[PDB]
């Protein structure tokens, strides 16, 4: 993972993000982080920013349909809706089985 991150950073000439990210976007030529929470998405987004701030874009998804993306809207709402539906399905199944 670190090899991929450093290779992409060198190729695109962007300073290496100090922490291992989740994905790298060629179109944006940047990094994308994914933090899956269960409460407010904005609070977890701010918590992530307090340590990262401007290192890379942040995407936050919550099982309660609450989300928080970066300042740039790139993905269409279809994928966001699909991800939210998948998370809601997982949460509902876990709660039904008393696993939540």
């Amino acid at each position: 993972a670190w090899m991929v991150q450093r290779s992409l950073a060198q190729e695109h000439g962007i300073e290496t993000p100090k922490y291992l990210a989740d994905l790298f976007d060629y179109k944006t030529k940047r990094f994308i982080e994914v933090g899956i929470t269960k409460g407010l998405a904005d609070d977890y987004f701010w918590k992530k920013k307090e340590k990262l701030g401007n290192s890379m874009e942040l995407m936050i998804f919550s099982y309660n349909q609450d989300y928080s993306l970066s300042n740039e809207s790139s993905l269409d709402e279809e994928g966001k809706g699909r991800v939210l539906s998948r998370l809601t399905e997982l949460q509902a199944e876990l709660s039904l089985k008393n696993l939540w």
């Binding site: 090899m3 991929v4 290779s7 992409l8 190729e11 060629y26």
Partner: protein, 45 residues
């Protein structure tokens, strides 16, 4: 520097070569047909 990792040498080599091929293609070092050959070889690997 000694390379660390609990994963197979083949896995590390394949991922490194895939990243190198993708960077070469994006930067234009490698031709599109050469990139296709590299991707096919890696897939069969």
């Amino acid at each position: 520097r000694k390379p660390v990792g609990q994963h197979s040498m083949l896995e590390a080599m394949a991922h490194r070569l895939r990243m190198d091929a993708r960077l070469d293609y994006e930067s234009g070092r490698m031709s599109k047909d050469d990139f296709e050959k590299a991707m096919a070889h890696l897939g069969e690997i």
